[PDB]
Symmetry: C4
Subunit: 258 residues, 4 copies
């Protein structure tokens, strides 16, 4: 199958749907569910969460599924086996706390050349790919060959996500969202582009751009027009903030955070 | 073979023996040996002990076997790979301290969907299945297809086991037994029933109820009447309290408790 | 092949050599090299050392081999995977510090029933088999079927080894040798005999006794008279004390002792 | 293929090139890149770095490759699984920090007899083979059969490398280079020679000497004259000091040093 990999940049709201492939899987990450409409449908092949709020995102995802807001086959933690990026015990006990999820690194590390590329840039130059690029790597390891990108906009003029992230619960869990620039300073356009180009060339897969007005389109060729249809389903009374587990839950998980 | 899984609720003493299957294995757990009569015979396929008193139960079981009070093929520790439920070193060194026993989780974790079901409810909602339900999961992983339940009564009106648990040694090892309600507050009827229903539906096995007067019978269909016979053998001068290992034994095991 | 397993009791010096099998391997343990004559030849199939002085015994063995006093194919550490019996890091890094040796437990644990037998008696009853019995278990795991025993005398009237153990270096490394009873209080005749009987019956091997005047002969049938010959080669200017590694060597090994 | 293994002794500059084999791979180690000319070409099959400065050497190597000063297929850390020789966490997380490199011990330990030989001499006698000998062992494990040695001179009259090692960055990272004798006191000619002889005899490979005026030639037969040609390419504006990673990089790696 073809895969659609979606960041949460503004271009998530400016997909050119006439270019949407006929039969695809969808990869979403992080606060994707803050979206005000189902820009890519409610069915996900995989959802990816950073290690830092994985405990609360997993909880929240279960509520989303129970609520029939989204479905997903795979749940991925976007880890790297780096002490500075993730809690060591969290990773060691992962499959025992989250038996229906995966460590994304199980797949990422299958791309040796890209693992090496990432680590060198991260460790020595503080140049860190974003989640969207990480999902691409995992897609490639899973055997996907045609990758359609959207919602990747390189944090222009602030973090500027495709939705309002200033929500009480997320702000309390992750105070970095209080300010306009909440993402890692080590991210950049060039870093993401160079990484994507490395992946395409190294693993001989194909990248397409679904959003013609995104800066991404200056670097990645457009998905072909197919005259596809898409009705964007609206959302109302939806989950638009992360949920906070009880203090008893935190206590049971306390060896696995910080 | 068919398996009979026995909790230690009052219904252990009100089995409808005309419904006992012809050829079965028996699973017992915890203080099963406190029973005043051999309500299910002295031959067990497996005995299951919680991690918390495993050290003393193993010792006690060896005495029971040496004494010809019970026989058993398998000895299981009912663990979950959760730091809040069990001592980490205990689990790591288990097969070296108890070479003829098993960690039950070796089998429980083979039921991925149920492992995930359990962990989510336990961690986030403090809803904990009971040992009887854990034995069912292990039975399923071992390949059993027809499961006959008894002694499961959901702790109605106190812990109310089928025997007197207020015994000197057990009270000293586990002071929680001093009070009428000694079991985990996180247990409940709904939690056990929902879990059992999940297992039956997910793994396409069959559950039966051996005790028509138990509340369990409101939820699980009765084992068919077969006109089976059973003479309940009495017990006298039997082991009705847990045994306490020497202080030298505790010293050797001290890295594996608390 | 048949194997001769030798403790270091007084009966080591009263082997009835007319009963020595025609083609055998020899297992020796601990301070075997303190012997004043080659009671079993200088060629060993295996030598076994307790964990406690393994570091110095390995060093000493290399000197014995370099000196052409003994040869051996296998070097075994007689471990049990018990924190109270052996240093944990020592066991974890063993093959990296001693690449041509083995942990005996790699073989001992292949005898599940006997592993369980040992652990239960050791942990709960403080009944500890001796090295001679441990070598028997390892012999069985290695596939030996006929086991000829000597030098097993149950520490009658003191530790009373077949040689003088009051040597400067051994006394400094292991002050317990200063007193007449230097062995573990948890050893006994009954414990060794019961264990040997368990092994013979459980693994359907054959035990023989090479020393007709040893108390062992009250329990184990005599090796058949074959009219075999044996000239006991004398030893002179031989290594009769353990060697002590340099303080630099101890420093490098310091994580692996105590 | 045949392999050329190069230490960084003065004889690196006195190779008899008429003896250079026709088709070979090249192994270099440590500060090899300090060389003022390409005494063995810019193409390496493998480069080996000691654990102590591996973090900075890896960084530096990437710059050398980016700069087209050298190429290499394999990057090896010359480790031994010894706490006194290398940082434990460094070794445990190695493949996650350096995904395109190898722990040399993965290969060294495949030579059991030599692993045992090394450990015994190192631990008990403080007799430590040099990197050149370590590369030979790894070459043998990789399947090389004909080994041509150069740049091995046993540190005569000081460490006396084939280049100036008194460089600001190396001196700051490794103050031992400030003095004329900066190498391990535990190295010696006899130790290296005995080890090389052990390897040749044990693994039935062939050693040759490329440098007729080196003391090595008193012990190892000369590579046959083949009338081979070689033009030594000069180096200018080359990297002649190790590079120092940023303080942010050190912070991310801080669990893996000291
Ligand atoms: N303005 C934005 C916001 C998010 N994104 C991308 O969306 C993905 C998910 O966002 P976060 O990793 O910050 O949660 C990342 O690739 C991020 O870089 C973007 O490209 N431009
Ligand atoms: N009154 C009781 C007592 C025990 N039981 C069940 O018997 C099994 C063994 O009891 P404990 O896990 O508390 O040792 C559990 O399933 C427990 O819930 C019950 O269902 N009702
Ligand atoms: N008097 C003795 C001395 C040693 N032995 C046996 O010789 C073997 C080696 O002695 P030690 O394990 O104490 O080093 C053991 O089986 C020990 O019990 C014996 O049986 N009688
Ligand atoms: N004067 C020298 C310098 C280095 N060498 C060898 O070059 C190799 C690399 O040097 P170092 O391991 O010290 O970095 C080692 O084998 C070292 O012994 C040598 O033989 N004589």
């Amino acid at each position: 199958k073809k895969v659609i990999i979606a960041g949460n940049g503004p271009s998530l709201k400016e997909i050119d749907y006439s270019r949407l492939p006929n039969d695809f899987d969808v990869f979403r990450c992080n606060q994707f569910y803050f979206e005000d409409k189902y820009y890519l449908g409610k069915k996900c092949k995989a959802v990816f969460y950073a290690p830092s709020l994985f405990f609360e995102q997993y909880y929240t995802l279960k509520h989303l599924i129970q609520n029939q807001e989204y479905e997903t086959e795979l749940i991925m933690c976007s880890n790297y086996n780096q002490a500075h990026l993730e809690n060591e015990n969290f990773v060691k006990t992962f499959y025992d706390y989250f038996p229906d999820a995966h460590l994304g690194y199980d797949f990422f590390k299958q791309l040796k050349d890209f693992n090496a590329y990432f680590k060198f840039h991260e460790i020595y130059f503080n140049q860190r790919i974003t989640s969207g690029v990480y999902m691409c790597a995992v897609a490639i390891a899973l055997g996907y060959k045609e990758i359609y990108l959207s919602g990747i906009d390189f944090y222009q003029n602030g973090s500027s996500y495709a939705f309002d992230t200033k929500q009480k619960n997320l702000l309390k869990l992750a105070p970095n969202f209080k300010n306009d620039n909440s993402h890692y300073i080590g991210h950049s356009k060039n870093t993401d582009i160079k990484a994507l180009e490395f992946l395409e060339k190294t693993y001989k897969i194909k990248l397409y751009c679904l959003c013609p007005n995104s800066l991404l389109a200056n670097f990645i060729g457009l998905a072909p027009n197919l005259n596809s249809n898409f009705i964007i389903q609206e959302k109302n009374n939806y989950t638009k903030d992360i949920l906070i587990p009880s203090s008893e839950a935190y206590g049971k998980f306390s060896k696995n955070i910080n």
